Design a binder for this molecule. Sequence first.
Ligand SMILES: *[C@@H]1O[C@H](CO)[C@@H](O[C@@H]2O[C@H](CO)[C@@H](O[C@@H]3O[C@H](CO)[C@@H](O)[C@H](O)[C@@H]3O)[C@H](O)[C@H]2NC(C)=O)[C@H](O)[C@H]1NC(C)=O
Ligand SMILES: *[C@@H]1O[C@H](CO)[C@@H](O[C@@H]2O[C@H](CO)[C@@H](O)[C@H](O)[C@H]2NC(C)=O)[C@H](O)[C@H]1NC(C)=O
Ligand SMILES: *[C@@H]1O[C@H](CO)[C@@H](O[C@@H]2O[C@H](CO)[C@@H](O)[C@H](O)[C@H]2NC(C)=O)[C@H](O)[C@H]1NC(C)=O
Ligand SMILES: *[C@@H]1O[C@H](CO)[C@@H](O)[C@H](O)[C@H]1NC(C)=O
Lengths: 230, 323, 331
Amino acid sequence: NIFEXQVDAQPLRPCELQRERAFLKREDYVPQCAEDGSFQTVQCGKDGASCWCVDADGREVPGSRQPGRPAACLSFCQLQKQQILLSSYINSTATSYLPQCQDSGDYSPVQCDLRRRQCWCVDAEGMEVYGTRQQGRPARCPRSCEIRNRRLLHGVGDRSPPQCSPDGAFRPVQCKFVNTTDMMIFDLVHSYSRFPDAFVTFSSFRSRFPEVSGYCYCADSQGRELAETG
Amino acid sequence: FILVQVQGGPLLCGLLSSPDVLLCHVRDWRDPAEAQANASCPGVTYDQDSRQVTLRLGGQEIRGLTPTSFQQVYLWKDSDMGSRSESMGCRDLTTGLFSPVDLIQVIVDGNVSLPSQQHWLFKHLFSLQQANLWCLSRCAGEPSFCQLAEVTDSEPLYFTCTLYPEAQVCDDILESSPKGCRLILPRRPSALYRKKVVLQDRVKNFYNRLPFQKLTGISIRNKVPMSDKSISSGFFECERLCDMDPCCTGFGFLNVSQLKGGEVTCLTLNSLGLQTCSEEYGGVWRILDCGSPDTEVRTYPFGWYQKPVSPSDAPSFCPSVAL
Amino acid sequence: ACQRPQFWQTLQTQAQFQLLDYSGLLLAFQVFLLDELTARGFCQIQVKTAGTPVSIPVCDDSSVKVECLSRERLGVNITWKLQLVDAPPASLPDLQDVEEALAGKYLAGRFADLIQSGTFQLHLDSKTFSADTSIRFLQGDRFGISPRTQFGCLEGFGRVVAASDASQDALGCVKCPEGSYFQDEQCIPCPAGFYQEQAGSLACVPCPEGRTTVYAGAFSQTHCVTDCQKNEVGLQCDQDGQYRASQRDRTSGKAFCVDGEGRRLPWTEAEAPLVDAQCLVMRKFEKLPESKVIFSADVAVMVRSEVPGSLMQCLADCALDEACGFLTVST
Ligand SMILES: *[C@@H]1O[C@H](CO)[C@@H](O[C@@H]2O[C@H](CO)[C@@H](O[C@@H]3O[C@H](CO)[C@@H](O)[C@H](O)[C@@H]3O)[C@H](O)[C@H]2NC(C)=O)[C@H](O)[C@H]1NC(C)=O
Ligand SMILES: *[C@@H]1O[C@H](CO)[C@@H](O[C@@H]2O[C@H](CO)[C@@H](O)[C@H](O)[C@H]2NC(C)=O)[C@H](O)[C@H]1NC(C)=O
Ligand SMILES: *[C@@H]1O[C@H](CO)[C@@H](O[C@@H]2O[C@H](CO)[C@@H](O)[C@H](O)[C@H]2NC(C)=O)[C@H](O)[C@H]1NC(C)=O
Ligand SMILES: *[C@@H]1O[C@H](CO)[C@@H](O)[C@H](O)[C@H]1NC(C)=O
């Protein structure tokens, strides 16, 4: 479970919103969500008597409902390929892009148009990472923690850069600073750039920022704070 | 008169009377991949569309009967064009995008390599007001090539409207101001107008920070001070300035004059030169250039940034740069 | 041509089953069937290693081919191609171990049971396409009841050993050389006017528009040649591969000038050597046959310039007159 410190709007994905609303209304079907917040491709029912497959939006794929767990469900990358191809047959469209899926079923990190002319990087949900479209395969697709850090420099979110692993993923332990006076997140990106000498020791840090305390927590794969670990 | 010989086809011989704008010059950067539908400059088009090559010269389109090679116009220089009796049986929202350039900043070296697109607007129907508006409107219609538009009236029959890409040339000194940057144009322009840079909302490239801290033999395109901004805002602007330059291969976001306290600076580059002094290597044994104390390029988010590596090269009009 | 042979690089098995309208685009069903095969794990080999199991991909976009045989019964071809560079040498030591992993209980035996059962159906907009219980295996033009493997080469490598006698010779793959491109298991020489410089390529780079190649199988940029350089009649050429304006005959020292094309202009053949600069001016004139000339009264330019010490010189005077339209020369 995730619950961030300062944010007013929690970064909950649609499955996690529909799961919480259903558990509250004591419905007999409560959506099952993956660790990253996506719908699991197999959705069970009350006691698992009936189970079906779903698409990326949680909509049941017709003909899949079954007593017992379905033997195989198409991934969201593969289910998008079907809807594009049927669309052209149903509604004439000269396709320019068909998703490329890894053999595990997830989206390939690099996605190319059918002319192999333009390519871009997608996230784990098939969504284009902005600024990655170019001619030919991108040499190195940025990872989630690196993307979060760049968007922070463009004015998105708070001013505390998350700590990244060498591969570009989030480190499991995330640490930020809190200004205890106004109870706000300490502006780390600007303070570090203007006062790099204040970060040599904790003696020099608390001399310059005497009201600032540390706040660390466990983060999930998307960098979101796990509930009640701060 | 116009003379046209499509390759191994019929030969056209058009006569001209009171033309308004001669438009395509043999030495003009033409867009390598430009749709023939969008009034492509060379009139010939649709070669064998249905085995017929249409010619849209003048204002009149030849049917297309053609089974290119030579195409020229000729002009009677000492013409009576402007002073001719009519009985002889003859026949503002864009000016705000530009800003005049102080002609003094221009250096005139006739030998410079600068691609251009020339036009002749004839004076018998063009006033200097209209010529300045025709020239500016045409520059704003070529958003991939034209950064500068100059107008000249040093000729008796026509105004000259030549469009340039960015003409600024800088030295490789890491400094916050553009004082070693000059405009080099082949001729003195009567009026020189620069399209105002407009920053898009989003960045178009995901720039990669170089691991190297020292660059040798760089080529700078522009120097912009950023000390009146937050570090986050300055980085965001530096990214979008290199986005707007088709010849930019990367930028530097750094403190210069660090011995006097440092000044936040954006340097757009069209060549990164020799990249040395990586933080990952040279730990026990360093031989290359390192340790420049008047520059701060280490602290996040300072650094040298590269536009993502693509096998598609820069536009052909971009200046050639070599170590 | 002569290159180093290499070992067989790929292994291949093919099976056929039937899916139970026409005159339509079936290539959609090729993607749909591959997705269903991928979903149930028939496009990977899983090797029971000690710790982490490696996965060998055995499919591509060409793996599934469908043909329409009769109404309500489609014909499906499935082809598993293993690249030997992906087979882990620690888990599958011998090439026999690789064959049995591709044609045994983990890939092909596990797929024959699924088809023979009756539990393979494809979900397509609430419609169901269940598969017939019959499955057949290619065995070298004779569809048998047991899978046989077939050796092959990688993308850029041409076959030099026939498929049948792959059991006899192990070196069956050669990389396409510098003069060549790859298509369809063969290495084909760059055609005339095209050149390739790097081996194992898929196409031939065309020569620059002003140049071509004298023969096929060109293997460098310099092999693209102009019309002058190819010329064999002895005409000398300047740099940049353009015809030298001034020429001298092979048999005699007699000197003549040629046009932009190699056409040898007559009436410029003179005993005195002509410098190229002398031919440039004469190249800009044309000599009129008598049929185009009329002898009658007209007016002559009165130029009284320093009289020479000369047709070559006389033409040059007209070449800078800007009023001279033409001239005549006496004997
Ligand atoms: C890059 O250059 C900028 C601008 O020169 C540097 O920012 C400046 O940093 C200094 C010291 O870190 C700030 O000076 C003052 O320091 C006293 C301590 O005696 C302190 O009491 C003041 O509140 C103030 O911080 C100066 O304000 C600051 N200027 C701006 C515009 O932020 C920056 O440090 C340089 N970056 C690096 C990595 O060297
Ligand atoms: C922590 O937050 C407090 C706000 O309560 C900051 O103190 C304020 O600083 C501004 C200047 O930016 C002054 O105008 C206010 O009067 C201050 N308020 C109080 C109550 O003193 C403080 O600067 C913050 N600390 C850091 C390190 O950011
Ligand atoms: C499915 O596979 C079979 C067997 O490889 C193909 O049948 C062969 O087709 C080729 C080309 O038409 C012939 O030269 C062979 O003689 C055929 N062999 C047999 C045993 O019939 C068939 O064409 C494939 N179908 C598709 C759609 O690719
Ligand atoms: C530029 O080149 C021209 C001719 O090539 C020459 O006349 C002129 O002197 C040159 N300019 C210099 C050398 O500054």
